[PDB]
Each structure stands twice: as structure tokens, then as C-alpha cells.
Design a protein around this ligand. Structure first.
Ligand SMILES: [Mg+2]
Length: 382
């Protein structure tokens, strides 16, 4: 039929892939980026989506929307919505039981269902694919967390349809990640698979069973408020403390200063997966004072040591709920950029008494990769 795509509609970042001729291409956006922030901004003149939206967040915090996935398919009264709302700069209001985000856009008050905000993100992902393919894109598989209920899946599906997509199927993220690695193609006895998914804002452990190639979710665990961004935070605080010791100044109430430091820390954290030190080079960070410094891998691990180690606790709980020893796991699959952290891999490999991890697919892209594989199956192109 048409060309069908796989879309990871992520809490922090979204990613789109296409399976063409026995090969997945993860598609770079117009800025060369293979992932796109799940951000939508509203200004005096325009509606911004992705990188453009995330780049003006410090300047426009009340009209720049993110974490829409934390709201999707939920009711305003839901306690989860009530805690989370306390940590966003934009407004969330009640429209007859259902949460809406309220913003100012071109001088008028406007509100949006979370599915409408995620539809804007999905629109961007579709455009991304169409720019690469040079063809109209309609058919898609969109992924969701394994714990999403009927209402959250429907709303996700509805976000796709508002975007003009035909959602072939909603499938689970950890199932998508297993598909990416072709685990459902390893013919033999039933396989027990653990997915260790440490993203930007969420941490998910899932245990799946694959019998004759069919997936069942045995267990889910994790922490909906632990992600790569928590590690970034600790580096930010570390560097704010260091600037204060050095310059006897506190940069904390300058939003742009803290934003620019945070972006540098995000970059440094990635660098630390590959190198044993990272440099921070910020021109005129605060009151005209430059900030050139660095951090070692060791210092980064020390700052985060409790957070890293504690990831093993939901691993133990998922195993318990699935009724399995750790030795019963046949495949371990890494998803999320933070699973590139050597200390995390080491922690998890040691926990599984030396077992090798599925880590060769970019963990930022593994969800979209699997979703693309599955898109191709469903449309008859694989
Ligand atoms: Mg994810």
C-alpha cells in the first residue's frame, strides 16, 4: 500500500523510523537530529514544535508545553495529574472532568486536550518522515508504555488520527524494543525478556514472555519520575555550587543562565558515555562571567551513585511479580539514552551475573526501530 512508519511518541523525545527493503532507517529531522523533543510552544505570532519549541523555553515558560504524555487519557481529578501539575510552569485547567493545557497564543487564551498537544508532536514526526521519503505518510504504528490503560491508548490513537495518521496498531514500547532485536524470531522454548528502559523522564522495567512468537506482559515496574533528566539536575546543582565557590555569585534565579548550564550538562552526560571526562564551555554565563570547566566520568557517577544503584530495585520487583529468578531471563534489552552510561551497564550486567546485554541498537532509537519493523509487517511490506 503506502509507506508505513514507526513512531515512538516519547515523554521527553519522539523518534520516527521506516522499514524499507530489510533495513530500518531512523529519520533525522531538518536539524539533523534523529530524535525530536516532545515540546510545543505558542508565541505572539506562531506555534512551534520540537527543537524550535524547546530552544525558547527559558524565554517563554508559561506557553511552552511538554510532558503532555503524563496527562494523555487521564482525568483532571486523577491524583497523578494533581501531583504533576504542581511542577509545570504552564496552566492545566478542568473542562468538564477532562484536563486541558491553557496557554496564550497570538494574544488570545487558548486551551488544548493532551491528545491535541501530542497530535502536534505526531504531525511533526510525520513531516519528518515525509521530508525524508519525498512521499505522503499516513500509516503508522505508534508505541505506548506497557502500563497504559485502555483510555491512555485510545487517546494516543486519537492523537494520531487528529494528526491525519491512520494508526495501524498501538503496541507496547518494550514489545517494540524486543521486535527491534528480533527476539520474537528466535524459535525455541518460551523466552523470558527483561527490558530496562531508562529514558529522559521515566524509568520502566518490563518482563515479557514470548511463546511461539506471541508476546505477553508478565510484569511492569520502575519509577515514573526517574530519568536521565534527574542526573542532568545533579550536574546542574554541582556546577552552580562550583560557580558560587569560584565567583561568589549564585546564578540560580537567572533562568537563561540555568537553561544554558543544563543544556551543557545534557551534552556532557552523553560525552561521558564515551569518554572519561567532559568539558563545559559557556560564554558569559552570568553577569558577564564565562564558565569554562570540566567534569570526570568518576565525578558524574559519584554525584548519581544512589540513583544508579536504586535502578536495580524495580528490576527485583519486576522479577518477583513475574515469578522468575534472574537466571530465568533469556534476553536483557537496553532502551533509553541513559542505558549508554557504563556504570549502569556494569550495575545491570553484574546483577545478571555477567550476562551480555542487547545494546547494539541506539537505545534512543530502539522503540521507533521496532515500531517501524512492525509497521512494515502490518502493511504487508515485510
Ligand atoms: Mg522511551
Amino acid at each position: 500500500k503506502g509507506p508505513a512508519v514507526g513512531i515512538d511518541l516519547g515523554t521527553t523525545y519522539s523518534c520516527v523510523g521506516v522499514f524499507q527493503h530489510g533495513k530500518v532507517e531512523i529519520i533525522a529531522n531538518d536539524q539533523g537530529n534523529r530524535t525530536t523533543p516532545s515540546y510545543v510552544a505558542f508565541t505572539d505570532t506562531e506555534r512551534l514544535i520540537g527543537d524550535a519549541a524547546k530552544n525558547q523555553v527559558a524565554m517563554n515558560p508559561t506557553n511552552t508545553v511538554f510532558d503532555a504524555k503524563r496527562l494523555i487519557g487521564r482525568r483532571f481529578d486523577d491524583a497523578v495529574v494533581q501531583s504533576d501539575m504542581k511542577h509545570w510552569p504552564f496552566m492545566v485547567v478542568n473542562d468538564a472532568g477532562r484536563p486541558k493545557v491553557q496557554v496564550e497564543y497570538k494574544g488570545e487564551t487558548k486551551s488544548f486536550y493532551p491528545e491535541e498537544v501530542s497530535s502536534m508532536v505526531l504531525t511533526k514526526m510525520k513531516e519528518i518522515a515525509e521530508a525524508y521519503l519525498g512521499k505522503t505518510v499516513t500509516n503508522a504504528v505508534v508505541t505506548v508504555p506497557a502500563y497504559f490503560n485502555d483510555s491512555q491508548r485510545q487517546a494516543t490513537k486519537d492523537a494520531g488520527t487528529i494528526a491525519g495518521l491512520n494508526v495501524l496498531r498501538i503496541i507496547n514500547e518494550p514489545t517494540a524494543a524486543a521486535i527491534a532485536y528480533g527476539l520474537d524470531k528466535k524459535v525455541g522454548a518460551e523466552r523470558n525478556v527483561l527490558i530496562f528502559d531508562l529514558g529522559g523522564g521515566t524509568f520502566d522495567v518490563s518482563i515479557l514472555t514470548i511463546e511461539d512468537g506471541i508476546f505477553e506482559v508478565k510484569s511492569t515496574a520502575g519509577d515514573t519520575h526517574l530519568g536521565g533528566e534527574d542526573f542532568d539536575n545533579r550536574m546542574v546543582n554541582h556546577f552552580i555550587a562550583e560557580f558560587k565557590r569560584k565567583h561568589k555569585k549564585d546564578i540560580s534565579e537567572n533562568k537563561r543562565a540555568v537553561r544554558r548550564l543544563r543544556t551543557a550538562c545534557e551534552r556532557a552526560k552523553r560525552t561521558l558515555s564515551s569518554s572519561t571526562q567532559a568539558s563545559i564551555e559557556i560564554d558569559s554565563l552570568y553577569e558577564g562571567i564565562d564558565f569554562y570547566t570540566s567534569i570526570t566520568r568518576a565525578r558524574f557517577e559519584e554525584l548519581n551513585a544512589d540513583l544508579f544503584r536504586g535502578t536495580l530495585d524495580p528490576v527485583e520487583k519486576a522479577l518477583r511479580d513475574a515469578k522468575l529468578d534472574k537466571s530465568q531471563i533469556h534476553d536483557i534489552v537496553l532502551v533509553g539514552g541513559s542505558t549508554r552510561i557504563p556504570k549502569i551497564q556494569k550495575l545491570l550486567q553484574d546483577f545478571f551475573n555477567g550476562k551480555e546485554l542487547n545494546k547494539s541498537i541506539n537505545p534512543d532509537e530502539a522503540v521507533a526501530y521496532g515500531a517501524a519493523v512492525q509497521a512494515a509487517i502490518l502493511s504487508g511490506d515485510k
